[PDB]
Copies of this chain bind each other. A is one copy, B any other.
Amino acid sequence: QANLWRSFLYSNVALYLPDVYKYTPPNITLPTNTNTYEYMNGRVVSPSLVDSYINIGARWSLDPMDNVNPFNHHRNAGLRYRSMLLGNGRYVPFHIQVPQKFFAVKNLLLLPGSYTYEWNFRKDVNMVLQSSLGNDLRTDGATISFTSINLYATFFPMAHNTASTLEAMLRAANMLYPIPANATNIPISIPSRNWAAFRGWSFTRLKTKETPSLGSGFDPYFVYSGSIPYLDGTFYLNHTFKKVSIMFDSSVSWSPNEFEIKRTKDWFLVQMLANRMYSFFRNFQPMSRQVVDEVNYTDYKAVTLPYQHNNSGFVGYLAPTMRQGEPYPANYPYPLIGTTAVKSVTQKKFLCDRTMWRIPFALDMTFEVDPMDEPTLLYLLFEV
């Protein structure tokens, strides 16, 4: 039973940890590119980082994992469904049908005139395909190729009298802001546009490595093919927000100036008032855990990860290597229960994903964010 549990935890959590926690085995040479399959595979993660005892007896997502795209997983049901749909081989021919979207949200109709309609398609593999790991598919050796595209259209009758009647009868902005690494403040200034149509705005945090530089023919710097939350709405870094303050300029209320994200019931109420799959209360999840007290327990000594030994002698040491070591009592973790329990404190955190923030309704703001180790972008959806 222990082996089955450890194998599950390994294969479903440990291999997907950030790269800072892994290492390159000695005597092996791996590519210098950090987004290629060979590199993402060669690195080996110690099996003891997530062991059988991790947060024993509670619901708690791992601290490293919160800032990792959960959708770039091999248990992604939809991605696996699609990959099966294409087949089980490397070379497969595809027959597909796709709906036009620009006119799906604009809903245009054409009267006489004999128009010309030209559209372009993509052959960049990264943006057209997807991968569980997210390894640059462009350099790996994936390619796409078309043979014939034809357009299917459906006209409808309408009397010329009706068209003449109509003819004689009637006679959202997107902004992306930078966020340097390990930033905490972000003062932004909205460009001055028509103050009207400010029917609330949304905002979420993304990654520079994930948002593509849409607005050209081909972005050479897009070296990732996983989930693009900027395009499919799979946002996950919504819990890294602390406080958003608007300048003193007056605003219509559905109108405070600063909202506290996490120190708060106020934000819960605001988001509920702003109100499916992409909606609050379907992706909000609080959690609570008891942990060893730091300052009251007098005999506390924080052992660093390299010097923590549990299951010594019966597992590879800091490596998926064969048996090594000698049996000996463990030192990690500290018993929170039992006849020799230690003093405890309570921790609390929440995860909200596949969603967005919605503030109800020259403008200046200041944003607070929990520091992160890679560049991020502040996405703003000014509905108009």
On A, residues with C-beta under 8 Å from B are 51, 53, 55-61, 66, 70, 84, 87-93, 287-290, 310-311, 333, 336-337, 341, 343-344, 346, 349, 351, 353
Contact = CB atoms under 8 A, between A and B. Distances in A.
Contact of A89 (B60, B311, B336): B336
A277 to B, nearest CB: 12
Contact of A51 (B56, B287, B310, B346): B310
A289 B60 contact: yes
A58 B70 contact: no
Taking the full assembly, how many copies of this chain does it contain?
Answer: 6
Contacts of A92: 290, 346
Given A89-B337, A333-B56, A344-B89, A66 B287 contact: no
A287 B61 contact: yes
Nearest to A61: B351
19 contacts: A51-B310, A56-B333, A58-B84, A58-B87, A58-B88, A58-B290, A59-B287, A66-B349, A66-B351, A87-B290, A88-B336, A89-B344, A90-B336, A90-B337, A90-B341, A90-B344, A91-B343, A91-B344, A92-B346
B289 A53 contact: no
Contacts of A290: 58, 87-89, 91-92
Given A310-B51, A333-B53, A289 B88 contact: yes
Contacts of A57: 88, 336-337
Nearest to A57: B88
Contacts of A351: 61, 66
Q: Which of A57, A89, A336 has the most CB of B within 10 A?
A: A89
Nearest to A89: B290
A353 B70 contact: yes
A55 B289 contact: yes
Contacts of A90: 336-337, 341, 344
Nearest to A59: B287
Contacts of A288: 58, 87
Contacts of A60: 287, 289
B311 A51 contact: yes
Contacts of A333: 53, 56
Lowest 8 CB-CB distances: which A-B pairs, in order? Answer: A89-B290, A58-B88, A57-B88, A89-B344, A60-B289, A58-B289, A90-B341, A89-B336
Given A56-B333, A58-B289, 16 more contacts: A53-B333, A56-B88, A57-B88, A57-B337, A59-B84, A59-B289, A61-B287, A61-B351, A87-B288, A87-B346, A88-B289, A89-B290, A90-B336, A90-B344, A92-B290, A92-B346
Contacts of A289: 55, 58-60, 87-88
Nearest to A87: B290
A42 to B, nearest CB: 14
Nearest to A333: B53
B53 A310 contact: yes
Among A70, A290, A310, max chain B CB count under 10 A is at A290
A59 to B, nearest CB: 5
A350 to B, nearest CB: 10
Nearest to A341: B90
Contacts of A87: 58, 288-290, 346
